[PDB]
Amino acid sequence: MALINPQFPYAGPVPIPGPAPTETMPLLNYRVEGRIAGIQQARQFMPFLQGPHREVAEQTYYAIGTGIQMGQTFNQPLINTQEG
């Protein structure tokens, strides 16, 4: 967006020496076929386990029984003959 100087104008570009025209043109680089080499193993001996863990520990229980329940020799009360 330059302003044209009317007192000192200039013309378009003139030819100048050039950079040997084939040396600015590249070759198209020619890929050969390739292979991810080797026979891959199916599994890996991992350093960490792959499953979930638990944040807190919960107390577990198992039921037990008591035993054969016996009789008893109670201390027996007195007879309510109007004193009680």
Binding site: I4, P6, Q7, P9
Partner: protein, 44 residues
């Protein structure tokens, strides 16, 4: 106010009539003037 402007060379001159002239005498002139460009600036 009125500049000297001819179309033919020497059609106006500057005159000095000297009374005494020594050896190796000379006359050093100095001008200021407007000259023109052919092919006007033409707005670009």
């Amino acid at each position: 106010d009125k500049p000297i402007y001819t179309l033919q060379y020497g059609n106006v001159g500057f005159v000095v009539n000297p009374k005494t002239v020594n050896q190796n005498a000379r006359l050093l002139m100095g001008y200021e003037y407007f000259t023109s460009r052919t092919e006007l600036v033409n707005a670009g």
